[PDB]
């Protein structure tokens, strides 16, 4: 699934993960650590919104 950072537009794609910041491809958004943040703007997980209806 993909989740967008409502502040900057960054897209956390679960299939891509976030390797540079310790997240391997395939990591679900809910499993990301509670203090993981958007690699672009630094927003907390609370500011992301899943891209699903
Ligand atoms: Fe962001």
Give the key terms:
about 55 residues, mainly beta, Rubrerythrin, domain 2, 3-stranded antiparallel beta sheet, 3 strands, about 0% helix, about 20% strand, binds fe (iii) ion
Structure description:
The PDB classes it as electron transport. The entry lists the keywords electron transport. This protein has strands spanning 2-5, 11-13, 48-50. With 53 residues, the chain is mostly beta strands. It is globular and about 25 Å long. The structure holds fe (iii) ion. Residues 5, 7-8, 10, 38, 40-41, 43 line the site of fe (iii) ion (FE). Fe (iii) ion (FE) binds at residues 5, 7-8, 10, 38, 40-41, 43.
In short:
It is globular, with a radius of gyration of 10 Å.
Report the sheet with the most strands, covering strand number, pairing sense and barrel closure: 3 strands, antiparallel
CATH fold-type name: Rubrerythrin, domain 2
Small ligands present: fe (iii) ion
Helix content: under 10%
CATH architecture: Single Sheet
Approximately what portion of the residues adopt beta-strand conformation?
15-25%
- Record field, number of beta strands: 3
CA distance, first residue to last residue: 12 Å
Shape: globular
Helix/strand-derived category reads mainly beta
Overall CATH class: Mainly Beta
Tally of individual domains = 1
Radius of gyration: 10 Å
Family: Belongs to the rubredoxin family.
Keywords: Electron transport, Iron, Metal-binding, Transport
InterPro entries: Rubredoxin, Rubredoxin-like_dom, Rubredoxin_dom, Rubredoxin_ET, Rubredoxin_Fe_BS
Protein name: Rubredoxin
């Amino acid at each position: 699934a993909k989740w967008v950072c409502k502040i900057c537009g960054y897209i956390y794609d679960e299939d891509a993960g976030d390797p540079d910041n310790g997240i391997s491809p395939g990591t679900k958004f809910e499993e990301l650590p509670d203090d993981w943040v958007c690699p672009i703007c630094g927003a907390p997980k609370s500011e992301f919104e899943k891209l699903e209806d």
